RNA sequence: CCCAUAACCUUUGUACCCGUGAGAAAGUGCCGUUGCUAUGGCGCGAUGAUCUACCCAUGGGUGGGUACAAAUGGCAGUCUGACAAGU
């Protein structure tokens, strides 16, 4: 909470996410492109034991990520691990795809998908700084127009605000998602339907997952950080949902 | 040939609706008016939605605002005429972008939510 | 004979250190400035100078795919860099940008050549000033000894134990003040003999080496009519060598 | 009846021939979805037949782009003509599983006799192929698919957004960082030249104003013992005998009682001074290059303030984009001085916005803002 | 080529070897080796045809244009595809223009070495008019005119 | 090697200093074009109006806060001292 005050790193329950204890506790993830912070968040530097080299970690802001909100609220099992591939629908910018690439780490990948052009351009420059983020600037309603660029990703994280968010996730996870593979959904109920009760929106969206053969494990409302969102963690089953 | 970068404008009907609501917000202090005032508000996070003129000379000096709007899922609409926006906001001079801020002690809440839906269908 | 000034030697060591720092940071900048055309080249060939010479030779990945590069690479590394040249994720670059990257890369080559020249100068100069100590401990560590303690004369007058512990003063005075076991190699650790031992023999060889280095130094800084052949260095080196063979012959574990 | 299927890949096209169909009515059951996943049964199903690899990165880009919109490239037409057998266009066409309903009619309009199937069962098979990847290929897939995937994704997306230099500013950032480092090392190495030359000869190291020309003087004048009036006039061809420094330090060298140092030491002073000379020249060259790259990238900002100052701002705010995003008051450039600075801050933020989002920008608006702030300074 | 070799020089089926060749060129439209070999086969076939004509005679500018139309399309394809190789400023654009020209002169001089005959080379130089290389061209021109 | 190839600290050299969002000024008013009337243009602002320690009557001398350089200025003092290995 200053430019010099030390903290004590520690690792979380999850794999690849760390906690910086101190007077006030930060959720932090290890950087990949060091030195350069992207959206102005305060990165934390450490020294580690060849003569030694400074290694550097980055604070994860829950108020600007609808995923670190889920973590810092509590999730039973998040499906992003440090070895995997994350397909990322709706990647507006580095504001969260950077952190997903930090916790995926150099072995895995993240296929960021976005449609519009100006955030696309910014995503391209950042992706040149970061080797994992394959940027796809195609519409996400039609996965068929980039079925050559992607193969068998191991979780799909979804951040769209479309009112047909179910059908778009269903398409993409049928085409690409490996069997029994995690699906993380950030519902924003006001956008998905603006008249009905937010609970009613959640029930309808969860249901549509279930008859799209995604067994939903777990549901959270992420309350003090944002109002009305819910991330649903589910599993693509494909062979007998029961 | 493709869409120009002023997209989306609004029809005359949406135009008069939006100018109506931005006037009444300016009466009740839910309106932050002007370019960098809209920018500071989109950094704070407390803005319902953005109204950008498209008549401006040039287009670009306010064209920087769709980036932040799409970064934060906050909707934006081009009105056609910048002196019509000055008209509605009730200050004496052409305002190229105003921003209606969030609040609840608001006599105009549900009027604002109706126009916010109308925008988000228009996108 | 005016070619004996420890002042030029000690400031030469300082400037050698400065050269190493600045060369590394400039090649960092070049590697990532160019990798913004050809990305994985840095990770494949991490060497600064090899990188700069690749930038001189080729300028476009396919130009490298056609051109020989194998003068300065092994051929498997050559195959990797040629294939990654065939498909990088990198872009193409305009001519003025390749121009100034090119001039940077040749400037990198010039620092490498300059450093080699400086070190060759220094080795010959140490051979002129203290050829006994040079012949014993190796001239880089010899020059660093002289650099730390300053005058060749004051280094001559130090005893032999303090020549053993001439580099590690922080750990020394911490250990002395807090009743702990004082550090034992010091700055001699980079001599080839103590880099040749194994474990407790490293500690013992640093004692034998520090004592014979004190003899070598005192013969050098005080014997006014020196024959410049370094023979005391050669004799005492043969002594230290023989010690090393005796220690490493001894086998701590049963036969 | 799904006789062949067509799988397009990051490299090349492949055409597989099905052997057993899976059942049709019971297409949903647990047994049959687990046989999509497990490789003993899948290799009962699909047998590879043909495979034409792409010819280069450029064609792979072009052909991925053609699949993305929908038409049929010539390489796809070639491989289809090689592999399919010629059947009636009315009775018993040859079926073909594809994974793109829109890719249907393009194939159908080329070959009248191929009926393209993309149902649940065809999508099933294509999923199976994409999952089992490279085992099915019996080794033929020359080339590392993983790296092809990365490169193809980047190229296709970059071409959709038209990514290029005039909006690229990372060159400006790196040139700034390297210029600051050059000036740091230049003044340090000037200190060391001056000290060696002073240690045999203190007074030019006290009495020469410019270190660069001092380095020229060390490169020319070898020592205090190499002195002649032709060298006097060579310094006159250099900076100034108008000052008479050449004559005066002939006198100073005749009175300079410093160590007459050895020749090898003189040669190394020579080499190090020459190296400093090359470095400083290179710095000046890079400075002019930076000015030119700026006139490409953000001309309006540069004309509004000054090229190197625009560089300073761009490196501070992190990139051209973040400079645009930045609030127009918190941009900071370097009482009534404060007011004119703040007004200029508003102006330069707006000019940066127009440079960022244009294409080949508006030096007329560089001039407009220039004259506007000139009028405000005129008031001041 | 191996397939063509076996169907021509063993069974003599001009239809078969012809179709092999046009198919293979549709698959590889940017390999000079294959273009070379197709021109070669057409020459060998027509030489067999002309010797068959003279042996019929003994017992009792169209084909060259076939070969050179193959040359024409060969040059078009080779230029286009080696543009697409290396695919953006004016200097390097012109640089690839001269490099691609250099490449095509290299293989066309090879075609000369493959090579009635003076008529064919006439058609070649007609193709050329339709700096140092200009000189080399015209010294070949006077040399062949002598020859 | 957690770096005495360094950090601190004093001392010298070189730099600086106390967001806000609507107000600001109290026939000529100006200049010039026209002969014996036509006037040329100018006359604020969301494309940002108003706000962010000492003495001698816009001076220098004080005073501390931040950054660049140096020092044979400091912290700050250079380990043990007869046995060991073989048969």
Short mmCIF file of N, CA, C and O in Angstrom, two decimals, chain A residues 117-224:
data_model
loop_
_atom_site.label_atom_id
_atom_site.label_comp_id
_atom_site.label_asym_id
_atom_site.label_seq_id
_atom_site.Cartn_x
_atom_site.Cartn_y
_atom_site.Cartn_z
N UNK A 117 -12.68 -3.99 -33.40
CA UNK A 117 -11.36 -3.78 -33.93
C UNK A 117 -10.41 -3.01 -33.04
O UNK A 117 -9.26 -3.42 -32.92
N UNK A 118 -10.81 -1.92 -32.40
CA UNK A 118 -9.85 -1.19 -31.57
C UNK A 118 -9.34 -2.00 -30.38
O UNK A 118 -8.10 -2.07 -30.21
N UNK A 119 -10.18 -2.66 -29.57
CA UNK A 119 -9.61 -3.58 -28.59
C UNK A 119 -8.83 -4.67 -29.23
O UNK A 119 -7.85 -5.13 -28.64
N UNK A 120 -9.18 -5.05 -30.44
CA UNK A 120 -8.39 -6.04 -31.13
C UNK A 120 -6.97 -5.57 -31.35
O UNK A 120 -6.02 -6.31 -31.12
N UNK A 121 -6.82 -4.32 -31.75
CA UNK A 121 -5.50 -3.82 -32.06
C UNK A 121 -4.66 -3.79 -30.81
O UNK A 121 -3.47 -4.18 -30.81
N UNK A 122 -5.29 -3.40 -29.70
CA UNK A 122 -4.52 -3.36 -28.46
C UNK A 122 -4.15 -4.75 -28.00
O UNK A 122 -3.04 -4.97 -27.47
N UNK A 123 -5.03 -5.70 -28.23
CA UNK A 123 -4.73 -7.07 -27.90
C UNK A 123 -3.56 -7.59 -28.70
O UNK A 123 -2.77 -8.36 -28.18
N UNK A 124 -3.42 -7.15 -29.95
CA UNK A 124 -2.33 -7.65 -30.78
C UNK A 124 -1.00 -7.17 -30.24
O UNK A 124 -0.03 -7.93 -30.15
N UNK A 125 -0.92 -5.89 -29.87
CA UNK A 125 0.35 -5.37 -29.36
C UNK A 125 0.76 -6.07 -28.07
O UNK A 125 1.91 -6.52 -27.90
N UNK A 126 -0.19 -6.19 -27.14
CA UNK A 126 0.13 -6.91 -25.91
C UNK A 126 0.52 -8.35 -26.19
O UNK A 126 1.46 -8.87 -25.58
N UNK A 127 -0.17 -9.02 -27.11
CA UNK A 127 0.18 -10.39 -27.40
C UNK A 127 1.55 -10.50 -28.00
O UNK A 127 2.15 -11.57 -27.94
N UNK A 128 2.05 -9.46 -28.60
CA UNK A 128 3.43 -9.55 -29.03
C UNK A 128 4.37 -9.44 -27.85
O UNK A 128 5.50 -9.93 -27.91
N UNK A 129 3.94 -8.78 -26.79
CA UNK A 129 4.77 -8.82 -25.57
C UNK A 129 4.66 -10.16 -24.83
O UNK A 129 5.54 -10.50 -24.04
N UNK A 130 3.58 -10.90 -25.04
CA UNK A 130 3.32 -12.14 -24.29
C UNK A 130 3.13 -13.35 -25.20
O UNK A 130 2.18 -13.37 -25.99
N UNK A 131 3.89 -14.41 -25.06
CA UNK A 131 3.94 -15.41 -26.12
C UNK A 131 2.78 -16.35 -26.15
O UNK A 131 2.76 -17.24 -27.00
N UNK A 132 1.86 -16.27 -25.20
CA UNK A 132 0.82 -17.28 -25.07
C UNK A 132 -0.50 -16.88 -25.65
O UNK A 132 -1.38 -17.74 -25.80
N UNK A 133 -0.72 -15.62 -25.89
CA UNK A 133 -2.05 -15.13 -26.10
C UNK A 133 -2.21 -15.08 -27.60
O UNK A 133 -1.85 -14.09 -28.21
N UNK A 134 -2.77 -16.11 -28.20
CA UNK A 134 -3.03 -16.11 -29.64
C UNK A 134 -4.29 -15.29 -29.87
O UNK A 134 -5.37 -15.70 -29.43
N UNK A 135 -4.20 -14.16 -30.50
CA UNK A 135 -5.37 -13.32 -30.62
C UNK A 135 -6.15 -13.65 -31.84
O UNK A 135 -5.62 -13.72 -32.94
N UNK A 136 -7.45 -13.83 -31.65
CA UNK A 136 -8.39 -14.16 -32.70
C UNK A 136 -9.40 -13.03 -32.73
O UNK A 136 -10.13 -12.85 -31.75
N UNK A 137 -9.49 -12.31 -33.83
CA UNK A 137 -10.32 -11.12 -33.88
C UNK A 137 -11.50 -11.41 -34.77
O UNK A 137 -11.77 -10.69 -35.73
N UNK A 138 -12.15 -12.53 -34.53
CA UNK A 138 -13.31 -12.92 -35.30
C UNK A 138 -14.53 -12.83 -34.40
O UNK A 138 -14.39 -12.75 -33.19
N UNK A 139 -15.71 -12.74 -34.99
CA UNK A 139 -16.94 -12.86 -34.23
C UNK A 139 -17.00 -14.23 -33.59
O UNK A 139 -16.51 -15.22 -34.13
N UNK A 140 -17.61 -14.28 -32.44
CA UNK A 140 -17.67 -15.50 -31.69
C UNK A 140 -18.98 -16.22 -31.86
O UNK A 140 -19.12 -17.33 -31.36
N UNK A 141 -19.96 -15.62 -32.52
CA UNK A 141 -21.16 -16.38 -32.76
C UNK A 141 -20.91 -17.55 -33.68
O UNK A 141 -21.50 -18.61 -33.48
N UNK A 142 -20.01 -17.39 -34.65
CA UNK A 142 -19.74 -18.37 -35.70
C UNK A 142 -18.35 -18.88 -35.46
O UNK A 142 -17.39 -18.27 -35.92
N UNK A 143 -18.18 -20.00 -34.79
CA UNK A 143 -16.85 -20.54 -34.59
C UNK A 143 -16.31 -21.19 -35.82
O UNK A 143 -15.10 -21.46 -35.93
N UNK A 144 -17.19 -21.45 -36.75
CA UNK A 144 -16.81 -22.19 -37.92
C UNK A 144 -15.86 -21.39 -38.77
O UNK A 144 -15.07 -21.98 -39.50
N UNK A 145 -15.81 -20.08 -38.63
CA UNK A 145 -14.94 -19.31 -39.48
C UNK A 145 -13.53 -19.24 -38.97
O UNK A 145 -12.71 -18.55 -39.57
N UNK A 146 -13.22 -19.85 -37.85
CA UNK A 146 -11.84 -20.02 -37.43
C UNK A 146 -11.57 -21.40 -36.88
O UNK A 146 -10.61 -21.58 -36.15
N UNK A 147 -12.37 -22.37 -37.27
CA UNK A 147 -12.11 -23.76 -36.91
C UNK A 147 -10.73 -24.29 -37.29
O UNK A 147 -10.41 -25.42 -36.92
N UNK A 148 -9.93 -23.57 -38.05
CA UNK A 148 -8.59 -24.03 -38.37
C UNK A 148 -7.58 -23.55 -37.35
O UNK A 148 -6.45 -24.04 -37.30
N UNK A 149 -7.92 -22.55 -36.58
CA UNK A 149 -6.87 -21.90 -35.83
C UNK A 149 -6.71 -22.47 -34.44
O UNK A 149 -5.76 -22.10 -33.76
N UNK A 150 -7.61 -23.33 -34.01
CA UNK A 150 -7.75 -23.73 -32.62
C UNK A 150 -7.90 -25.23 -32.55
O UNK A 150 -8.62 -25.82 -33.35
N UNK A 151 -7.20 -25.87 -31.63
CA UNK A 151 -7.50 -27.27 -31.43
C UNK A 151 -7.66 -27.70 -29.99
O UNK A 151 -6.71 -27.58 -29.23
N UNK A 152 -8.86 -28.15 -29.61
CA UNK A 152 -9.07 -28.92 -28.39
C UNK A 152 -8.50 -28.24 -27.16
O UNK A 152 -7.43 -28.55 -26.68
N UNK A 153 -9.22 -27.22 -26.74
CA UNK A 153 -8.82 -26.46 -25.61
C UNK A 153 -9.43 -27.06 -24.36
O UNK A 153 -10.40 -27.79 -24.40
N UNK A 154 -8.81 -26.82 -23.23
CA UNK A 154 -9.13 -27.59 -22.04
C UNK A 154 -9.97 -26.89 -21.03
O UNK A 154 -10.23 -27.48 -19.99
N UNK A 155 -10.31 -25.62 -21.24
CA UNK A 155 -11.36 -24.96 -20.48
C UNK A 155 -11.91 -23.83 -21.31
O UNK A 155 -11.16 -23.29 -22.10
N UNK A 156 -13.17 -23.49 -21.20
CA UNK A 156 -13.61 -22.28 -21.90
C UNK A 156 -14.12 -21.22 -20.93
O UNK A 156 -15.06 -21.42 -20.18
N UNK A 157 -13.50 -20.07 -20.96
CA UNK A 157 -13.91 -19.02 -20.06
C UNK A 157 -14.67 -18.03 -20.89
O UNK A 157 -14.24 -17.71 -21.98
N UNK A 158 -15.79 -17.55 -20.39
CA UNK A 158 -16.72 -16.82 -21.22
C UNK A 158 -17.11 -15.53 -20.55
O UNK A 158 -17.61 -15.55 -19.42
N UNK A 159 -16.93 -14.42 -21.24
CA UNK A 159 -17.23 -13.11 -20.69
C UNK A 159 -18.15 -12.28 -21.54
O UNK A 159 -18.16 -11.06 -21.39
N UNK A 160 -18.89 -12.86 -22.46
CA UNK A 160 -19.74 -12.05 -23.29
C UNK A 160 -20.90 -11.50 -22.48
O UNK A 160 -21.17 -11.91 -21.34
N UNK A 161 -21.60 -10.53 -23.05
CA UNK A 161 -22.82 -10.01 -22.43
C UNK A 161 -24.02 -10.15 -23.35
O UNK A 161 -25.07 -9.57 -23.08
N UNK A 162 -23.89 -10.94 -24.40
CA UNK A 162 -24.96 -11.16 -25.35
C UNK A 162 -26.17 -11.75 -24.65
O UNK A 162 -26.03 -12.40 -23.62
N UNK A 163 -27.37 -11.50 -25.13
CA UNK A 163 -28.50 -12.29 -24.67
C UNK A 163 -28.58 -13.71 -25.20
O UNK A 163 -29.47 -14.42 -24.76
N UNK A 164 -27.73 -14.16 -26.12
CA UNK A 164 -27.73 -15.58 -26.46
C UNK A 164 -26.47 -16.29 -26.01
O UNK A 164 -25.96 -17.20 -26.68
N UNK A 165 -25.98 -15.87 -24.86
CA UNK A 165 -24.71 -16.32 -24.33
C UNK A 165 -24.68 -17.83 -24.18
O UNK A 165 -23.64 -18.46 -24.36
N UNK A 166 -25.83 -18.43 -23.93
CA UNK A 166 -25.87 -19.87 -23.87
C UNK A 166 -25.58 -20.48 -25.22
O UNK A 166 -24.83 -21.45 -25.31
N UNK A 167 -26.14 -19.94 -26.29
CA UNK A 167 -26.02 -20.68 -27.53
C UNK A 167 -24.60 -20.52 -28.03
O UNK A 167 -24.01 -21.47 -28.53
N UNK A 168 -24.02 -19.35 -27.83
CA UNK A 168 -22.65 -19.13 -28.27
C UNK A 168 -21.66 -20.01 -27.50
O UNK A 168 -20.76 -20.60 -28.10
N UNK A 169 -21.84 -20.17 -26.19
CA UNK A 169 -20.94 -21.05 -25.47
C UNK A 169 -21.15 -22.48 -25.89
O UNK A 169 -20.20 -23.26 -25.98
N UNK A 170 -22.38 -22.85 -26.18
CA UNK A 170 -22.63 -24.21 -26.58
C UNK A 170 -21.96 -24.56 -27.87
O UNK A 170 -21.43 -25.65 -28.01
N UNK A 171 -21.98 -23.64 -28.83
CA UNK A 171 -21.31 -23.87 -30.10
C UNK A 171 -19.84 -24.04 -29.89
O UNK A 171 -19.22 -24.98 -30.42
N UNK A 172 -19.24 -23.12 -29.14
CA UNK A 172 -17.80 -23.15 -29.08
C UNK A 172 -17.33 -24.34 -28.30
O UNK A 172 -16.38 -24.98 -28.71
N UNK A 173 -18.03 -24.72 -27.25
CA UNK A 173 -17.60 -25.87 -26.50
C UNK A 173 -17.92 -27.16 -27.17
O UNK A 173 -17.31 -28.16 -26.82
N UNK A 174 -18.90 -27.23 -28.05
CA UNK A 174 -19.03 -28.45 -28.81
C UNK A 174 -17.89 -28.60 -29.76
O UNK A 174 -17.33 -29.68 -29.90
N UNK A 175 -17.55 -27.51 -30.44
CA UNK A 175 -16.54 -27.62 -31.46
C UNK A 175 -15.20 -27.94 -30.87
O UNK A 175 -14.52 -28.84 -31.35
N UNK A 176 -14.81 -27.25 -29.82
CA UNK A 176 -13.43 -27.30 -29.39
C UNK A 176 -13.20 -27.95 -28.06
O UNK A 176 -12.19 -28.58 -27.92
N UNK A 177 -14.08 -27.82 -27.10
CA UNK A 177 -13.75 -28.20 -25.73
C UNK A 177 -13.54 -29.68 -25.58
O UNK A 177 -14.34 -30.48 -26.06
N UNK A 178 -12.46 -30.05 -24.92
CA UNK A 178 -12.14 -31.45 -24.72
C UNK A 178 -13.21 -32.04 -23.85
O UNK A 178 -13.88 -31.31 -23.14
N UNK A 179 -13.43 -33.33 -23.94
CA UNK A 179 -14.49 -33.91 -23.13
C UNK A 179 -14.18 -33.75 -21.65
O UNK A 179 -13.01 -33.67 -21.26
N UNK A 180 -15.22 -33.65 -20.83
CA UNK A 180 -15.10 -33.47 -19.39
C UNK A 180 -14.22 -32.28 -19.05
O UNK A 180 -13.28 -32.36 -18.27
N UNK A 181 -14.48 -31.17 -19.68
CA UNK A 181 -13.60 -30.03 -19.57
C UNK A 181 -14.33 -28.82 -19.03
O UNK A 181 -15.49 -28.59 -19.33
N UNK A 182 -13.62 -28.03 -18.25
CA UNK A 182 -14.29 -27.02 -17.46
C UNK A 182 -14.83 -25.89 -18.30
O UNK A 182 -14.32 -25.59 -19.37
N UNK A 183 -15.88 -25.26 -17.81
CA UNK A 183 -16.56 -24.18 -18.49
C UNK A 183 -16.88 -23.13 -17.44
O UNK A 183 -17.63 -23.42 -16.52
N UNK A 184 -16.35 -21.92 -17.58
CA UNK A 184 -16.51 -20.87 -16.56
C UNK A 184 -17.28 -19.71 -17.14
O UNK A 184 -16.85 -19.13 -18.13
N UNK A 185 -18.40 -19.35 -16.55
CA UNK A 185 -19.34 -18.46 -17.21
C UNK A 185 -19.54 -17.23 -16.37
O UNK A 185 -19.99 -17.36 -15.23
N UNK A 186 -19.37 -16.06 -16.93
CA UNK A 186 -19.67 -14.88 -16.15
C UNK A 186 -20.99 -14.27 -16.58
O UNK A 186 -21.00 -13.38 -17.42
N UNK A 187 -22.09 -14.71 -15.98
CA UNK A 187 -23.39 -14.15 -16.30
C UNK A 187 -23.47 -12.73 -15.79
O UNK A 187 -23.11 -12.47 -14.64
N UNK A 188 -23.92 -11.80 -16.62
CA UNK A 188 -24.34 -10.49 -16.12
C UNK A 188 -25.81 -10.26 -16.39
O UNK A 188 -26.21 -9.93 -17.51
N UNK A 189 -26.61 -10.38 -15.35
CA UNK A 189 -28.02 -10.63 -15.54
C UNK A 189 -28.73 -9.45 -16.15
O UNK A 189 -29.70 -9.65 -16.89
N UNK A 190 -28.28 -8.24 -15.88
CA UNK A 190 -28.97 -7.08 -16.44
C UNK A 190 -28.85 -7.05 -17.94
O UNK A 190 -29.76 -6.60 -18.63
N UNK A 191 -27.72 -7.49 -18.46
CA UNK A 191 -27.53 -7.52 -19.90
C UNK A 191 -28.25 -8.69 -20.51
O UNK A 191 -28.80 -8.56 -21.60
N UNK A 192 -28.24 -9.83 -19.84
CA UNK A 192 -28.83 -11.01 -20.45
C UNK A 192 -30.34 -10.90 -20.52
O UNK A 192 -30.94 -11.22 -21.55
N UNK A 193 -30.98 -10.42 -19.47
CA UNK A 193 -32.33 -9.94 -19.67
C UNK A 193 -32.57 -8.80 -18.70
O UNK A 193 -32.36 -8.92 -17.50
N UNK A 194 -33.10 -7.72 -19.23
CA UNK A 194 -33.22 -6.51 -18.48
C UNK A 194 -34.56 -6.32 -17.83
O UNK A 194 -34.75 -5.30 -17.17
N UNK A 195 -35.49 -7.24 -17.99
CA UNK A 195 -36.74 -6.96 -17.32
C UNK A 195 -36.94 -7.82 -16.09
O UNK A 195 -37.28 -7.30 -15.02
N UNK A 196 -36.69 -9.12 -16.21
CA UNK A 196 -36.99 -10.09 -15.16
C UNK A 196 -36.03 -9.98 -14.00
O UNK A 196 -35.04 -9.25 -14.05
N UNK A 197 -36.37 -10.65 -12.92
CA UNK A 197 -35.53 -10.69 -11.76
C UNK A 197 -34.20 -11.32 -12.09
O UNK A 197 -34.12 -12.25 -12.89
N UNK A 198 -33.16 -10.84 -11.43
CA UNK A 198 -31.83 -11.37 -11.70
C UNK A 198 -31.73 -12.85 -11.37
O UNK A 198 -31.04 -13.60 -12.08
N UNK A 199 -32.43 -13.30 -10.34
CA UNK A 199 -32.46 -14.73 -10.07
C UNK A 199 -33.06 -15.48 -11.22
O UNK A 199 -32.61 -16.57 -11.56
N UNK A 200 -34.09 -14.92 -11.81
CA UNK A 200 -34.77 -15.61 -12.88
C UNK A 200 -33.85 -15.75 -14.06
O UNK A 200 -33.81 -16.80 -14.70
N UNK A 201 -33.05 -14.73 -14.30
CA UNK A 201 -32.05 -14.81 -15.34
C UNK A 201 -31.06 -15.92 -15.05
O UNK A 201 -30.64 -16.66 -15.96
N UNK A 202 -30.68 -16.10 -13.78
CA UNK A 202 -29.69 -17.13 -13.50
C UNK A 202 -30.27 -18.51 -13.69
O UNK A 202 -29.61 -19.40 -14.20
N UNK A 203 -31.51 -18.70 -13.27
CA UNK A 203 -32.13 -20.00 -13.44
C UNK A 203 -32.24 -20.36 -14.90
O UNK A 203 -31.92 -21.49 -15.29
N UNK A 204 -32.66 -19.41 -15.74
CA UNK A 204 -32.80 -19.72 -17.16
C UNK A 204 -31.46 -20.03 -17.80
O UNK A 204 -31.34 -20.98 -18.58
N UNK A 205 -30.43 -19.26 -17.49
CA UNK A 205 -29.14 -19.50 -18.12
C UNK A 205 -28.52 -20.81 -17.66
O UNK A 205 -27.96 -21.55 -18.48
N UNK A 206 -28.63 -21.14 -16.37
CA UNK A 206 -28.12 -22.42 -15.88
C UNK A 206 -28.84 -23.57 -16.54
O UNK A 206 -28.21 -24.53 -17.00
N UNK A 207 -30.16 -23.47 -16.64
CA UNK A 207 -30.94 -24.48 -17.31
C UNK A 207 -30.45 -24.72 -18.72
O UNK A 207 -30.09 -25.85 -19.03
N UNK A 208 -30.29 -23.67 -19.51
CA UNK A 208 -29.86 -23.83 -20.89
C UNK A 208 -28.51 -24.51 -20.98
O UNK A 208 -28.26 -25.28 -21.90
N UNK A 209 -27.65 -24.30 -20.00
CA UNK A 209 -26.44 -25.10 -19.97
C UNK A 209 -26.77 -26.57 -19.82
O UNK A 209 -26.27 -27.40 -20.58
N UNK A 210 -27.68 -26.90 -18.91
CA UNK A 210 -27.96 -28.31 -18.63
C UNK A 210 -28.53 -29.04 -19.82
O UNK A 210 -28.21 -30.20 -20.03
N UNK A 211 -29.39 -28.41 -20.61
CA UNK A 211 -29.73 -29.10 -21.85
C UNK A 211 -28.80 -28.78 -22.99
O UNK A 211 -29.10 -29.12 -24.13
N UNK A 212 -27.69 -28.10 -22.73
CA UNK A 212 -26.62 -28.14 -23.71
C UNK A 212 -25.55 -29.09 -23.30
O UNK A 212 -24.46 -29.03 -23.86
N UNK A 213 -25.81 -29.88 -22.27
CA UNK A 213 -24.99 -31.00 -21.79
C UNK A 213 -23.76 -30.53 -21.05
O UNK A 213 -22.75 -31.21 -21.03
N UNK A 214 -23.86 -29.42 -20.39
CA UNK A 214 -22.82 -28.95 -19.53
C UNK A 214 -23.36 -29.11 -18.13
O UNK A 214 -24.24 -28.36 -17.73
N UNK A 215 -22.87 -30.07 -17.38
CA UNK A 215 -23.34 -30.24 -16.02
C UNK A 215 -22.75 -29.15 -15.18
O UNK A 215 -21.54 -29.09 -15.07
N UNK A 216 -23.55 -28.30 -14.56
CA UNK A 216 -23.00 -27.19 -13.80
C UNK A 216 -22.68 -27.60 -12.38
O UNK A 216 -23.53 -28.16 -11.70
N UNK A 217 -21.45 -27.39 -11.95
CA UNK A 217 -21.09 -27.87 -10.63
C UNK A 217 -21.46 -26.87 -9.56
O UNK A 217 -21.82 -27.25 -8.44
N UNK A 218 -21.38 -25.58 -9.85
CA UNK A 218 -21.14 -24.64 -8.78
C UNK A 218 -21.48 -23.23 -9.22
O UNK A 218 -21.28 -22.89 -10.37
N UNK A 219 -22.00 -22.42 -8.32
CA UNK A 219 -22.53 -21.12 -8.73
C UNK A 219 -22.27 -20.07 -7.68
O UNK A 219 -22.53 -20.31 -6.52
N UNK A 220 -21.79 -18.91 -8.08
CA UNK A 220 -21.45 -17.91 -7.09
C UNK A 220 -21.86 -16.53 -7.55
O UNK A 220 -21.81 -16.24 -8.74
N UNK A 221 -22.23 -15.67 -6.61
CA UNK A 221 -22.81 -14.39 -6.95
C UNK A 221 -21.85 -13.21 -6.91
O UNK A 221 -22.22 -12.16 -7.41
N UNK A 222 -20.66 -13.37 -6.34
CA UNK A 222 -19.58 -12.38 -6.37
C UNK A 222 -20.08 -10.99 -6.00
O UNK A 222 -20.25 -10.12 -6.81
N UNK A 223 -20.44 -10.87 -4.74
CA UNK A 223 -21.38 -9.80 -4.42
C UNK A 223 -20.71 -8.47 -4.14
O UNK A 223 -21.17 -7.46 -4.68
N UNK A 224 -19.73 -8.35 -3.24
CA UNK A 224 -19.31 -7.00 -2.87
C UNK A 224 -18.56 -6.29 -3.93
O UNK A 224 -18.44 -5.08 -3.87
#
